Design a protein around this nucleic acid. Structure first.
Ligand SMILES: [Mg+2]
Ligand SMILES: [Mg+2]
Ligand SMILES: [Mg+2]
Ligand SMILES: [Mg+2]
Ligand SMILES: [Mg+2]
Ligand SMILES: [Mg+2]
Ligand SMILES: [Mg+2]
Ligand SMILES: [Mg+2]
Ligand SMILES: [Mg+2]
Ligand SMILES: [Mg+2]
Ligand SMILES: [Mg+2]
Ligand SMILES: [Mg+2]
Ligand SMILES: [Mg+2]
Ligand SMILES: [Mg+2]
Ligand SMILES: [Mg+2]
Ligand SMILES: [Mg+2]
Ligand SMILES: [Mg+2]
Ligand SMILES: [Mg+2]
Ligand SMILES: [Mg+2]
Ligand SMILES: [Mg+2]
Ligand SMILES: [Mg+2]
Ligand SMILES: [Mg+2]
Ligand SMILES: [Mg+2]
Ligand SMILES: [Mg+2]
Ligand SMILES: [Mg+2]
Ligand SMILES: [Mg+2]
Lengths: 129, 141, 149
RNA sequence: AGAAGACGGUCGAACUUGACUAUCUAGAGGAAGUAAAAGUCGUAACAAGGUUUCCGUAGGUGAACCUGCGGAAGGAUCAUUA
RNA sequence: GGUGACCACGGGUGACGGGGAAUCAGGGUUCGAUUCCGGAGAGGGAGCCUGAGAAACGGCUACCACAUCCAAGGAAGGCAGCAGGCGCGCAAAUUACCCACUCCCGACCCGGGGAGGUAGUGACGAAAAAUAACAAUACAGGACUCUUUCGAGGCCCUGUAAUUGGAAUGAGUCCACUUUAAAUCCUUCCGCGAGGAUCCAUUGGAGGGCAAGUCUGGUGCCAGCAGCCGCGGUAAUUCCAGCUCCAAUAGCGUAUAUUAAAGUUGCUGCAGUUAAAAAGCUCGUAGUUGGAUCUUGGGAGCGGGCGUCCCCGCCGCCUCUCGGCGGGGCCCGAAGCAUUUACUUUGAAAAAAUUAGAGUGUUCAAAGCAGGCCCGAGCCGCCUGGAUACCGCAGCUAGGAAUAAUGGAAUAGGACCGCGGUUCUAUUUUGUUGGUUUUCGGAACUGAGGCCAUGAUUAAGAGGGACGGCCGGGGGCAUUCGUAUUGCGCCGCUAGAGGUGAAAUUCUUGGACCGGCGCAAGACGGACCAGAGCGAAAGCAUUUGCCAAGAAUGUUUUCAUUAAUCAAGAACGAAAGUCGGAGGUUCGAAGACGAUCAGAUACCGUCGUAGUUCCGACCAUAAACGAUGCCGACUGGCGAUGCGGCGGCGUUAUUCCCAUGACCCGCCGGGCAGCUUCCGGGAAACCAAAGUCUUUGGGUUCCGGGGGGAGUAUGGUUGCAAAGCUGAAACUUAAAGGAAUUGACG
């Protein structure tokens, strides 16, 4: 069933941007969704998303742009110990020149660059690039 | 698909464990059989006594007689055919003469022709065929 | 796609944004709790009350009119049933399957619909044991079941 | 003080007979496989393989085999012309 | 009583445990008997003395197991100390010299140490590194310059030769010295010590993988070659030889264990339409996995780029009931404690060697750890090192609270001198000690009040549960009918008919076959019947009744995380098959004959047993097949149809309309299906899904790792038995196979 609500959503916003779809809604919604999408907003990977408030769960509607090649999700949230952060961002991103492993540490949800500035580890969620 | 979860380190380990008794190359190595079966008791070469000289008929596409030796190994008393490599060297080896027999390179496969002959002769009465068939060291007497 | 059947259907109820009462309604939190009250008294299930109250009567949802949901209104006054209405509907059903199985020992079909039903019972039961509405002891028994309805 | 000694008890190698399990092997004679690869008797299969083929089960048969029943198409018909 | 599939218990090991090793894009994989740490045993056990300290083996006591001398009464035996030998063995050193170094025991500066060092053996292995260089010729060439080219000047070159030529050196040998303990070895050097014919480089190759000759001899499917592919049958690029070349090269070969290679064990990270492969189906305990939802925006400042936009310290809470740095504060000392963790970050602790890696003319390097210097040595001495990082998990400490669980108030409770009643008992206090009773301080208990905006998040395009009107060859149990079929009864007429690539056994004037009318028994439910229906899969169709059960839709019905998949364990499971029983309609293994055929113990015929038919037990398998696990998400079209709903625009009917109902036209959910396409997949065939996969991981179940041997043997278990389930190896084997292509033969 709905186990992981990212994988759910991120499939459907990778899986639109292939078709070139202009915008998409994501059915279940969550806090973690919002908080990881707002990360994608900063590096440009999407445009402004506007969350509907069906009284229950939430829907979102994501303005897409052309720019997202793929976003995916590492499904079990392994615990990343900062020394490993490299070994991951080697084998999970296309280059050292862009690509963003979104993860979730002590000091909020954020990309790997921002966990490195603050010097924290924590749990991998996914990656967009 | 695969089990993929996070407290699944065992279902995984124990999965990748048994699905090696379906590997062939480990069930030689880790089972028992091999050490029990190969006259060469896990041992690179072995010494044995030449009990007679036997020509073997090669596998159809290539007709020829191969010129091997029935050996009996010391350590086991297990018998053997070993193809005496290189031309006219069977001529050297006489009966009841102590030979150091090594493998063929296929470790169990019989090589090419020589149907069902894993072993090749190397030494003969502490000499080495390579020295004899070159004519460097003569036959001892 | 359902617990125990292939049919992967969806047909469900669906409420609006709005929750605030819809102004037809007179009654008030009291006169609804006066009425739930008299229906449960007469002998109806917490579902069945919610029913009578909407078709004939007026309340979209009790929950919105009063503070709490029907069961709590019965339970906090002590008109609530012995076991959950939701469960003895399965038990009553089981005992009905039992009966004709006991006359017709050929019905292979009835011998899921029993096994399934039994299993949808046990399954239910063992949260009602962790949510602690049932005491940690009660158990099905075929024999004692027919009585329990 | 005090040796040799003797009654008792305790750990207990050892020896004798059972039990188990492990491992390893002796064996009259019997039946497979493989080799392998050129003998005889057919010709089962692949072409509509001359009998669409195959599964399971059964029964039969010098041998492939054959025949029932239920299947399968991996067919030799994606159709049969209200 | 304790342990157990979070896999105990049992068995095995080519198992003394760590520290590391070689491998290695990241992750592992195997090895670690190996000098450092930890353990054990001295043929095996047991017991012993003695000892602080031992159950001590360079003690002894037996026994067992071994074995020596003998005067035959007796006696002495323990190398898994060092040397050595034997046996085993594919597989491993000298009866060497010594306390000089490091250390230890002693009563001890003084002896001893096979601990240890030093030699010898020593392609276990690692480092460095000769096996020649150079001038001039003779030439053999080729970039400037010169020449139309041929030629030449020549700064450039390089090939072979003459060695023309001397120069240089080491390998050796050996005066001498150092070394050391005495040597040896090394480092130092006198003296001798290079023209190849020497001071002499070999091992495999020379078709390809794979760098290197269809050079030349010989053999001629032999010998032989060839890890695989292969060559060899009279010119072999393949054998044996010759010459030439290539690779590495002082090393180099084959023996096999093992790692990459292996995206062929796949955590990262394989696969399951057909290639090896998804249980027949379903339930289901462990396990794994599980929606959303709860402090924030914002404030105050310092600092980058009147305000706006990045960048920092702040607004862990509570306590102060607790310390104190006659009444104090001030806040640290204590604890509510981080709900209870999981997580993350910082410490501390992590034996050295190894490792990573600071520093360093070991002549470099493996190494070594020193060295450097100051110094003309008058300095009678200075200066610096012996860096650091990692060190899993668990354990310890401290920050953070991103996510994951987990917790707290609901048949009432937190606090609020809120108040009392009951009891308790501590101790200050009555100039001291006892008694009684108090006040008070702290428990415990408990009457009765005040306040607390006093407590339930929502209902999942999750689930569970109620109700509604349909729906459906879903299941059972009754009941009813239909034909044909054979059987018989009767009657009519008459001689052939059935069967067939043709015929006969067969049935028949004892009148068969045919015709008619009657009964019979059992079968099976024709057309209607469909990419139509239902169930789980086996699955499921004459009428009617009854009996439960179910999907779907409908639903501002209720419950509220209850769920998915699931080892283990259950329910059902064509046919065939088996025990019971009932029945014998046809068909029909087996079985009998006729033909056909070279034969047919086959097909094609004619009989007909078990069984197909029923009721009762078992069995538990299919090509049980969509050769597609189940749940969950997403991505395009377009047509149709089953059900339910909804809406509309029709009308036939049907009535005055209606309600309907029957058609039409839409929409909506979930069903069975179709086509179409450069989504995107896909080896290919193909596939709305086999799509979302090097852009690798939504959850989870099963399961394959070349083919056979083999679904065999053996073991276990179930079964009355067929058999079912679990399920090896030796051996052999190079492809077997799959998808598509041309062929070519049906
Ligand atoms: Mg289920
Ligand atoms: Mg096949
Ligand atoms: Mg052993
Ligand atoms: Mg010994
Ligand atoms: Mg000891
Ligand atoms: Mg002892
Ligand atoms: Mg000794
Ligand atoms: Mg050796
Ligand atoms: Mg020594
Ligand atoms: Mg070396
Ligand atoms: Mg030399
Ligand atoms: Mg080659
Ligand atoms: Mg490997
Ligand atoms: Mg790799
Ligand atoms: Mg594979
Ligand atoms: Mg299936
Ligand atoms: Mg009919
Ligand atoms: Mg099972
Ligand atoms: Mg059956
Ligand atoms: Mg039957
Ligand atoms: Mg019977
Ligand atoms: Mg017949
Ligand atoms: Mg099967
Ligand atoms: Mg697939
Ligand atoms: Mg993958
Ligand atoms: Mg295999």
């Amino acid at each position: 069933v709905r186990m992981n609500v990212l994988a759910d959503a991120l499939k459907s916003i990778n899986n639109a941007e292939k078709r070139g779809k202009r915008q998409v809604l994501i059915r279940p919604c969550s806090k973690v969704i919002v908080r990881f999408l707002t990360v994608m907003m900063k590096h440009g990977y999407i445009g402004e998303f506007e969350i509907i408030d069906d009284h229950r769960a939430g829907k979102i509607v994501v303005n897409l742009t052309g720019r997202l090649n793929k976003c995916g999700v590492i499904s079990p949230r392994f615990d990343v110990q900062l020394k490993d952060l490299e070994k991951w961002q080697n084998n999970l991103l296309p280059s050292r020149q862009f690509g963003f492993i979104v993860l979730t540490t002590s000091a909020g949800i954020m990309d790997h660059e921002e966990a490195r500035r603050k010097h924290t580890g924590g749990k991998i969620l996914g990656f967009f690039f | 698909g695969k089990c993929r979860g996070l407290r699944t380190a065992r279902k995984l380990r124990s999965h990748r464990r048994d699905h090696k008794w379906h590997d062939k190359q480990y069930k030689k190595a880790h089972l028992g059989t091999a050490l029990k079966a190969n006259p060469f008791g896990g041992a690179s070469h072995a010494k044995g006594i030449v009990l007679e000289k036997v020509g073997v008929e090669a596998k159809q596409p290539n007709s020829a007689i191969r010129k091997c030796v029935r050996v009996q190994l010391i350590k086991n008393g297990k018998k053997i055919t070993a193809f005496v490599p290189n031309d006219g060297c069977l001529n050297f080896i006489e009966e009841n003469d102590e030979v150091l027999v090594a493998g063929f390179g296929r470790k169990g496969h019989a090589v090419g022709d020589i149907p069902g002959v894993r072993f090749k002769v190397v030494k003969v009465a502490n000499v080495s065929l390579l020295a004899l068939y070159k004519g460097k060291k003569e036959r001892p007497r | 796609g359902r617990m125990h059947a292939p049919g992967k259907g969806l047909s469900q109820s669906a409420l609006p944004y709005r929750r605030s009462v819809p102004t037809w309604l007179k009654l008030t939190s009291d006169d609804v709790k006066e009425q739930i009250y008299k229906l449960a008294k007469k002998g109806l299930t917490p579902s069945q009350i919610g029913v009578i109250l909407r078709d004939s009567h007026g309340v979209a949802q009790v929950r919105f009119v009063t503070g709490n949901k029907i069961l709590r209104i019965l339970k906090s006054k002590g008109l609530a049933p012995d076991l959950p209405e939701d469960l003895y509907h399965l038990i009553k059903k089981a005992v009905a399957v039992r009966k004709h199985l006991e006359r017709n020992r050929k019905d292979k079909d009835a011998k899921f619909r029993l096994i399934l039903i039994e299993s949808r019972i046990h399954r239910l039961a063992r949260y009602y044991k962790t949510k602690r509405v049932l005491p940690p002891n009660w158990k099905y028994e075929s024999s004692t079941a027919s009585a329990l309805v």
